[PDB]
Amino acid sequence: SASAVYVLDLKGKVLICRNYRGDVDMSEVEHFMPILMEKEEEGMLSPILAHGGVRFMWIKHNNLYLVATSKKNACVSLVFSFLYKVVQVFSEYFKELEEESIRDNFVIIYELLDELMDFGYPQTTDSKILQEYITQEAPRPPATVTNAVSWRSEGIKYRKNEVFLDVIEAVNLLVSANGNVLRSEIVGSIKMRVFLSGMPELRLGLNDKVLFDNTGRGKSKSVELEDVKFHQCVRLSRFENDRTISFIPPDGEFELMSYRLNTHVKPLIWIESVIEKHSHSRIEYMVKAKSQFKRRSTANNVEIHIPVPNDADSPKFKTTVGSVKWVPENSEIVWSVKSFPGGKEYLMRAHFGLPSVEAEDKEGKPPISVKFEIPYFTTSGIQVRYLKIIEKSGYQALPWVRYITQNGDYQLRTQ
Amino acid sequence: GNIFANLFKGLFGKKEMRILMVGLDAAGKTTILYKLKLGEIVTTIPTIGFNVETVEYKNISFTVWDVGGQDKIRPLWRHYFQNTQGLIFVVDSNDRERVNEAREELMRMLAEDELRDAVLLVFANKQDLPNAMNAAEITDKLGLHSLRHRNWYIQATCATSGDGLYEGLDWLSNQLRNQK
Amino acid sequence: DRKGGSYSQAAGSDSAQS
Amino acid sequence: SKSSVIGWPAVRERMRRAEPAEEVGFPVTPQVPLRPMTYKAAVDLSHFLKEKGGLEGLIHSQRRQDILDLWIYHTQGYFPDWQNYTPGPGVRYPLTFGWCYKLVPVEDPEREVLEWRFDSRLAFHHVARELHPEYFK
Ligand SMILES: Nc1nc2c(ncn2[C@@H]2O[C@H](COP(=O)(O)OP(=O)(O)OP(=O)(O)O)[C@@H](O)[C@H]2O)c(=O)[nH]1
Numbered sequence: 001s002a003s004a005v006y007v008l009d010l011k012g013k014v015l016i017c018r019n020y021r022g023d024v025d026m027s028e029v030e031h032f033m034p035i036l037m038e039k040e041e042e043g044m045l046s047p048i049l050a051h052g053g054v055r056f057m058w059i060k061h062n063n064l065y066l067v068a069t070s071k072k073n074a075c076v077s078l079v080f081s082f083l084y085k086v087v088q089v090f091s092e093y094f095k096e097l098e099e100e101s102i103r104d105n106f107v108i109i110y111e112l113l114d115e116l117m118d119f120g121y122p123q124t125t126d127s128k129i130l131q132e133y134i135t136q137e138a139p140r141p142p143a144t145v146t147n148a149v150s151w152r153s154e155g156i157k158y159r160k161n162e163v164f165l166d167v168i169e170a171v172n173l174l175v176s177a178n179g180n181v182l183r184s185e186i187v188g189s190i191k192m193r194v195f196l197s198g199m200p201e202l203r204l205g206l207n208d209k210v211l212f213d214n215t216g217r218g219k220s221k222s223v224e225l226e227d228v229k230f231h232q233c234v235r236l237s238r239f240e241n242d243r244t245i246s247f248i249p250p251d252g253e254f255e256l257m258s259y260r261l262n263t264h265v266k267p268l269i270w271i272e273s274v275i276e277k278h279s280h281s282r283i284e285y286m287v288k289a290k291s292q293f294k295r296r297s298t299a300n301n302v303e304i305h306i307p308v309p310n311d312a313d314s315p316k317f318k319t320t321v322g323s324v325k326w327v328p329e330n331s332e333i334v335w336s337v338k339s340f341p342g343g344k345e346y347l348m349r350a351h352f353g354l355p356s357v358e359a360e361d362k363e364g365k366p367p368i369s370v371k372f373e374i375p376y377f378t379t380s381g382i383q384v385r386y387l388k389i390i391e392k393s394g395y396q397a398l399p400w401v402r403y404i405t406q407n408g409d410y411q412l413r414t415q
Numbered sequence: 416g417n418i419f420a421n422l423f424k425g426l427f428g429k430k431e432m433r434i435l436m437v438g439l440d441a442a443g444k445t446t447i448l449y450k451l452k453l454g455e456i457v458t459t460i461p462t463i464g465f466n467v468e469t470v471e472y473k474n475i476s477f478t479v480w481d482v483g484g485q486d487k488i489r490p491l492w493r494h495y496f497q498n499t500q501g502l503i504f505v506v507d508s509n510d511r512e513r514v515n516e517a518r519e520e521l522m523r524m525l526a527e528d529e530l531r532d533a534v535l536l537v538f539a540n541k542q543d544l545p546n547a548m549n550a551a552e553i554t555d556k557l558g559l560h561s562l563r564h565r566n567w568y569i570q571a572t573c574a575t576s577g578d579g580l581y582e583g584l585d586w587l588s589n590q591l592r593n594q595k
Numbered sequence: 596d597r598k599g600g601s602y603s604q605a606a607g608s609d610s611a612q613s
Numbered sequence: 614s615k616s617s618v619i620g621w622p623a624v625r626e627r628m629r630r631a632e633p634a635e636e637v638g639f640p641v642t643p644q645v646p647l648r649p650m651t652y653k654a655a656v657d658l659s660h661f662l663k664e665k666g667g668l669e670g671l672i673h674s675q676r677r678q679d680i681l682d683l684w685i686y687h688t689q690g691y692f693p694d695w696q697n698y699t700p701g702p703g704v705r706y707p708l709t710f711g712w713c714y715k716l717v718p719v720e721d722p723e724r725e726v727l728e729w730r731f732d733s734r735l736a737f738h739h740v741a742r743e744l745h746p747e748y749f750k
């Protein structure tokens with residue numbers, strides 16, 4: 001129940017505002033900046049502000065914070081969802097999120113803001129569907145918005161029917177300073193770029209553990225996803241009945257399904273790091289990285305971020321394989337490796353200077369983060385079984401899919 | 416890469432080196448530095464801070480950073496341990512009660528893991544009174560031979576005369592430079 | 596080719612499950 | 614299929630070597646298609662196995678079945694899930710329609726000795742589907 005959706009800037013200037021209910025005066029935006037400054041300066045800064053009886057709940061974008069004032073007991077989750085939808089629409093329409101487009105795309109921005117939400121209740125949020133009614137360079141609205149299928153425009157025709165899938169893996173590992181892993185969660189991500197003719201009804205099929213158990217084949221390699229979240233095109237009833245994933249893919253790249261389950265396997269990379277930091281004299285970085293992943297897989301662009309001392313200067317690196325660079329902006333040792341064969345072992349010996357004068361305040365212990373991205377590797381063992389592309393006209397589809405394994409929340413706690 | 420310029424510089428002398436000046440107050444450190452730099456016995460007030468000078472000899476610029484022996488300045492020697500290549504210790508044989516304090520200070524300064532490549536340089540200061548010991552009794556009392564992985568050299572210099580400075584400089588040059 | 600694993604064609608359905 | 618013919622003797626020898634009773638990761642061949650085995654493909658494989666021999670009358674074992682499924686997947690790209698048998702006790706029919714191979718007793722269904730027996734009626738009659746309609750959906 002947002003009262004007015006407004007967009008501010010880094011200097012507190014409201015780039016664009018769009019009142020929805022009008023129950024809040026437009027002059028309350030002035031106190032938002034001082035309130036945010038006070039909250040941040042006292043540790044009480046939160047995305048949901050409160051100017052007396054009016055609450056300013058908003059998130060920070062790339063260049064401006066989309067703060068939306070509200071007065072009643074509106075759904076904060078609904079406001080956040082509307083803000084996320086607006087951000088996604090802006091990203092789809094504008095390739096960049098900065099002040100250069102707010103002052104240059106106001107003609108289309110105002111129309112999009114007016115059409116998206118009326119009286120604080122949004123009605124349309126599909127960028128592809130909205131692109132047929134609001135353009136910056138107007139006919140009747142398409143029947144897709146009025147029809148049930150609001151994510152697949154009818155009448156789309158293409159020379160070929162090629163759909164590219166992306167089985168993106170996110171390896172998140174939370175290794176404590178004692179050497180044990182606390183949080184090891186792997187979240188699957190099946191992103192497909194559907195480009196076909198008509199309105200095909202995709203019928204995705206995989207070797208799911210639940211599906212295998214229901215069919216009676218619960219003995220082969222099946223992915224046991226704790227959480228499986230289908231997209232808007234995925235029918236909830238079909239998945240709830242017999243694990244049937246039947247939905248109409250949209251025109252373009254979109255997120256269809258996102259598996260999420262815990263992982264009980266050993267880490268694909270084992271990092272043995274040592275810190276021989278002398279008292280204001282010198283420091284040693286005996287970092288050894290062992291690849292526990294399969295030897296047939298190569299981790300392209302391995303980036304093991306090693307947090308070095310903040311005041312360290314005049315450093316020397318004694319490594320084995322991979323480029324090691326210290327970035328003063330980041331204040332860490334970037335263990336950059338181009339290609340890492342599975343089972344490889346990289347040993348490094350850090351040596352950097354330290355000032356005699358001690359630091360005035362503590363800086364903490366940032367965790368060591370690895371940025372390994374090994375494609376063509378499926379740690380979870382989930383493999384796509386079938387993809388039923390059915391069209392009324394009748395055509396031979398050529399679906400495609402790729403499996404990419406990368407490091408997600410793969411942070412290692414320091415000692 | 417090309418090192419022709421480095422070879423040309425080394426053909427006529429390029430190495431300079433560094434040096435340190437530490438020790439107790441009234442140990443002849445300022446007078447020794449003045450004699451090494453100028454060549455005269457200059458009388459100065461006690462070194463509240465420190466003195467920095469350079470000595471040009473044998474085509475090597477021996478920069479010396481004098482450090483006082485004040486109680487409030489004893490723990491301040493760690494500031495000069497960074498980017499330090501040499502270290503010279505001046506003993507005070509005329510203070511029997513201060514000999515133990517000087518030995519303790521030298522042991523504490525030698526117990527640093529950053530100052531490990533600095534070889535020992537013991538200078539027998541105040542070599543003008545009959546009460547001064549020899550070049551071995553002081554070393555035996557201080558146990559300089561028990562410094563593992565440390566190259567110590569005991570040299571006796573007279574502040575009033577200046578004898579033995581050339582021998583100490585030659586020994587320091589031989590220890591630092593390992594060429595012809 | 597493409598970084599992150601070469602694209603592979605997918606099946607139509609579980610042929611072994613009828 | 615020259616590759617299938619070549620792999621049949623080695624697969625049979627490996628199955629015979631294994632008695633009837635180390636690397637981590639799941640590497641995938643780049644560009645190799647992966648899909649469930651089809652009824653026609655299963656029938657052709659059963660006919661080839663019957664003609665070549667080594668599968669009919671062989672003692673059924675979990676290790677031998679796993680090795681055969683892995684070899685079939687490597688040589689054809691078929692997932693090792695269509696080589697399933699109906700639960701015992703007694704004769705177990707193939708789970709995938711079109712398969713001509715079945716397990717029959719040779720003497721708890723787990724301790725019962727089973728051997729692979731050719732059955733041409735499997736490719737035409739869905740015995741496994743009729744026995745377990747719920748499993749077939
Ligand atoms: N007359 C005489 N006095 C000496 C001799 N050697 C050392 N001293 C005494 O040692 C002191 C040396 O002081 P400086 O050379 O100016 O500096 P320093 O050795 O670092 O002593 P502080 O300034 O107190 O740290 C002099 O004041 C002398 O009293 C010597 O050979 N003859």
Ligand SMILES: [Mg+2]
Nearest residue numbers: 444445446462
């Ligand atoms: Mg002095």
